[PDB]
Amino acid sequence: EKCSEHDERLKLYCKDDGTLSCVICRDSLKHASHNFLPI
Numbered sequence: 514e515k516c517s518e519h520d521e522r523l524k525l526y527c528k529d530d531g532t533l534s535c536v537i538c539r540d541s542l543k544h545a546s547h548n549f550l551p552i
C-alpha cells in the first residue's frame with residue numbers, strides 16, 4: 514500500500530475494479546485522493 518505519510522494507521526488501495534475511486538485507505542480520512550496500494 515503506497516498511501517505513505519498521511520494516517521497513523523490507515524493504508525490501502527483503490528484503482529479500477531468496478532468501484533472507481535473508493536476508500537483511499539479502507540476509509541478515506543484526511544486522504545481525499547492521495548494514493549494507496551492493496552496488501
Ligand SMILES: [Zn+2]
Pocket residue numbers: 516517519520523524525537538544549
Ligand atoms: Zn492513507
